[PDB]
Design a binder for this molecule. Structure first.
Ligand code: 4MS
Length: 559
């Protein structure tokens, strides 16, 4: 069937949308080439609609059903619980979209009786009615990029009312938090810190006699998801040991929301109908991960890839296997792709075999190597810093709900671009505003986290190790990619950043306490006469539970 049917009604914004890079007094210290930076708006939604709208055909074979059976066997070992209304309410981001029924996120969060009453009413209706399609809003996402000589159209987000979103948590939060690791084991990617992911990638790579690897880019994964896939997902959820009410609600959410339903714009006009994955439901991450792992695991068998190890984060897939040499690897991957295509996950750009781990991009990241304090080689994950820096420029001039810069510093802390540019720039800004103590929101694996900037040294230590504060002798390939980015964007040379970082560090040191700790660890690279970095005390008090358990993209989750 068609992924979507459209009425002609337009996808509408809630507020005016800026597409041009806002400029303030801080902008130029980061980036001179402002016209290279843009944000998507709803006004390009028609271009997206076009490309996410196609017919899906699905041909399912024995490998498919075999893998599914294995997945269900493991799923049946999971026991999951219902969350109370209040438990589910506390998982709601403060900035979440408000209900059409006269209450908002903060009402939910502080448990107003108005919110809670509507929630209980939504739940009761889920138990009673397992057929009536549930309403969703379709919006365009405003995301920032750099011009790639041209522009990406806005992504679409499809989400049900707040009342329904709290109910999803009640029925499925424990499931989507617990099931994927039990079903998929070490192949489930959202369980890893950056440190663990690079560890798992390197160990996997060198466990092969002659390693070959490839990332598989599905063309618009969400759109490729069929009703079959979503019913198949539900059948996996139902293997779990669940309370009768959770079973009923899960069945009801599947039939009424997950499978499809009507699409309404912000003005309340009907825009059409969806028959593929909604990107803004609780099950998007878990559903996509299970479905990608199933199709890929079965496609590996069909292609006869040898010792194929998968790493799956939603729709993001990387496979590492044994080479049969270049001719056979190329033919293998074609069989893999034909299978995936038969399963309704055709590729965007065709996959290509890789023989160098560092040339493989997965979760928009590639492995690279640097050296630590004692010369002892260390692997870490990095990326082309263009988009992170284009977004950092936007966020320098505009207050954003989610600070991408903060998530990039957290996840890319060991990189030369994050240490030298992002750390230096934003700590300078926090200092000027005396907002070092001010807790800031960022999204990691789709979930929103409130973070104190001053806890960054502890956070980085836990996620990457001390190495992250002592890394040097980065690779010519990486150094060239950074330098090329700065040239393109008109970002000041690294000597300018080194100069600035010295100032930032000194200023932090002068401050004392946690701020001096930020000065010492984060900016030890800037000083020629290096200080000794010991393991950070009282770091092992702060619990990073909720971190690196599961993915929740589009799932309206707050920790
Ligand atoms: C915060 C950033 C930097 C953005 C982080 C992230 O949170 C993600 C992600 N967040 S997400 O939206 O949950 C996500 C998906 C979600 N896809 S889906 C709809 O659920 O099917 C897939 C891949 C990756 C993601 C990511 O790729 N990242 C890059 C990255 C990932 C893992 C690492 F170990 C390192 Cl070092 C860097």
């Amino acid at each position: 069937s068609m992924s979507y049917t459209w009425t002609g009604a337009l996808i509408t914004p809630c507020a005016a949308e800026e597409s041009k890079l806002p400029i303030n007094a801080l902008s130029n210290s980061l980036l001179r080439h402002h016209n290279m930076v843009y944000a998507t708006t709803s006004r390009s939604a028609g271009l997206r609609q076009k490309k996410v709208t196609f017919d899906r055909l699905q041909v399912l074979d024995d490998h498919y059903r075999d893998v599914l059976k294995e997945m269900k066997a493991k799923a049946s070992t999971v026991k999951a619980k219902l969350l109370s209304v209040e438990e589910a309410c506390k998982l709601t981001p403060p900035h979440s979209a408000k209900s059409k029924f006269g209450y908002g996120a903060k009402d939910v969060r502080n448990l107003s009786s108005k919110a809670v009453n509507h929630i209980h009413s939504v739940w009761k209706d889920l138990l009673e009615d397992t057929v009536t399609p549930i309403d969703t809003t379709i919006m365009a996402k405003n995301e920032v990029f750099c011009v790639q000589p041209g522009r990406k159209p806005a992504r679409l987000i499809v989400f049900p009312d707040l009342g329904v979103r709290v109910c999803e948590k009640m029925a499925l939060y424990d499931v989507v938090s617990t099931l994927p690791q039990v079903v998929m084991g070490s192949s489930y990617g959202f369980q890893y810190s950056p440190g663990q992911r690079v560890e798992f990638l390197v160990n996997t790579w060198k466990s092969k006699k002659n390693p070959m690897g490839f990332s598989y880019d599905t063309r618009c994964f969400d759109s490729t998801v069929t009703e079959n896939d979503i019913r198949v997902e539900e059948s996996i959820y139902q293997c779990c040991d669940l309370a009768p009410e959770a079973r009923q609600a899960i069945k009801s959410l599947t039939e009424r929301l997950y499978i499809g339903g009507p699409l309404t714009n912000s003005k309340g006009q009907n825009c059409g109908y969806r028959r593929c994955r909604a990107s803004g439901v609780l099950t998007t991450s878990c559903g996509n991960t299970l479905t990608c792992y199933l199709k890929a695991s079965a496609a590996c068998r069909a292609a006869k890839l040898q010792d194929c190890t998968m790493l799956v984060n939603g729709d993001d897939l990387v496979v590492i296997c044994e080479s049969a040499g270049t001719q056979e690897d190329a033919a293998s991957l074609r069989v893999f792709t034909e299978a995936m295509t038969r399963y309704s996950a055709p590729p965007g750009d065709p996959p290509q075999p890789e023989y160098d781990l560092e040339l493989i991009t997965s979760c928009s990241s590639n492995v690279s190597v640097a050296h630590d304090a004692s010369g002892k080689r260390v692997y870490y994950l990095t990326r082309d810093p263009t988009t992170p820096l284009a977004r950092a420029a936007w966020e320098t001039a505009r207050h954003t709900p989610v600070n991408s810069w903060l998530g990039n510093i957290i996840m890319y802390a060991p990189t030369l671009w994050a240490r030298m540019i992002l750390m230096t720039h934003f700590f300078s800004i926090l200092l000027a505003q005396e907002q070092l103590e001010k807790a800031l929101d960022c999204q990691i694996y789709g979930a929103c986290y409130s973070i104190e900037p001053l806890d960054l040294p502890q956070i980085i230590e836990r996620l990457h190790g001390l190495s992250a504060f002592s890394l040097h002798s980065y690779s010519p390939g990486e150094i060239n990619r950074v330098a090329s980015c700065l040239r393109k964007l008109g970002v000041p040379p690294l000597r300018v950043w080194r100069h600035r970082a010295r100032s930032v560090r000194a200023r932090l040191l002068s401050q004392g306490g946690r701020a001096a700790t930020c000065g010492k660890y984060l900016f030890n690279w800037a000083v020629k006469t290096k200080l000794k970095l010991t393991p950070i005390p009282a770091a092992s008090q702060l619990d990073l539970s909720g971190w690196f358990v599961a993915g929740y993209s589009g799932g309206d989750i707050y920790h």
